[PDB]
Amino acid sequence: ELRVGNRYRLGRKIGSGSFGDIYLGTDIAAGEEVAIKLECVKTKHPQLHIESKIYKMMQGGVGIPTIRWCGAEGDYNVMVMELLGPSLEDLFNFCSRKFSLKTVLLLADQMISRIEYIHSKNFIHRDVKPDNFLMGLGKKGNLVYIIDFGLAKKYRDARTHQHIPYRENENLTGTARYASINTHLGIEQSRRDDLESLGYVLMYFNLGSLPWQGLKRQKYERISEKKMSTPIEVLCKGYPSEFATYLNFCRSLRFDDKPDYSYLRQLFRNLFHRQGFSYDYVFDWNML
């Protein structure tokens, strides 16, 4: 009877993340299903324990899943996590690659806040993308959660807020489709880069696709050439100027700058209200 420590029965694979696979679990002790992350202990650079400490620093924030680091069982490090609902990439597909402007702005408000909270606890996420935001369950079905801290990194000192130095970091960490221009140029990531990636995620929702998507490491330069050759004003054309304004404000932030989260939220909130929408948490998937 294959269980993690007498408590959660292990089920089928339900996803991949950074640095391991995710499996379904059943808490016979409570009554809920859980997600179970497993990492093969045979590596010189194990990551699961580290990732679960970041989760522990983020507990109590809105939209942060609760986890439980259960240590090593033979060949695997185990971390039990709150099972949430579908990812935004999943919901985008239910909705046939179309989100209403209201839904995008409903998401923008929450995704900006999630990123702000992470930054408040001194980490940058480094892989902002639609698969790493999931809707909650039940009474939390209106709530956007952020997940996967396996590429996350401390960007400032916890007691003195000394920001990490500006330096060339030459590993592309994260998905290339949403990577900031600073990352394509080999610069260490900071808070500005999480938000620029959110800017691309938003326009991806609006367009259904990005101009650097289906491009035939050669492909990684192809994306970066195309991403830099494509001015912001062309990428966001035929959509409210606020998306262009968002993206320009992210690219113009200084490396160590504390982003103005209220400003970005207010761009979208004011456009939201001018269209007459109400923050009622009725997304496109709430009308089937």
Author numbering: 2 to 217, 222 to 293
Sentences from the paper on this structure:
PER2 is regulated by a CK1-dependent phosphoswitch, where kinase activity at two antagonistic sites functionally interact to control PER2 stability.
To test the role of Site 2 anion binding in regulation of CK1 activity, we made charge reversion mutants at positions R127 and K154, as well as at K171 located nearby on the activation loop, and measured enzymatic efficiency (kcat/Km) on FASP and Degron peptides in vitro. We observed a modest decrease (~25%) in activity towards the FASP peptide, suggesting that the ‘loop down’ conformation that is enforced by anion binding at Site 2 may be important for FASP activity. Strikingly, these mutants all increased activity towards the Degron, with a ~ 50% gain in efficiency for R127E. To further examine the role of K171 in regulation of anion binding, we solved a structure of the K171E mutant crystallized in high sulfate conditions and found a full complement of three anions bound, demonstrating that local flexibility in the activation loop allows it to retain sulfate binding at Site 2 to some degree. Overall, these data suggest that anion binding at Site 2 correlates with substrate selectivity on the FASP and Degron peptides. Notably, the change in selectivity with Site 2 mutants in vitro makes them much more tau-like, consistent with a recent report that both tau and charge reversion mutants at Site 2 lead to decreased PER2 stability in cells.
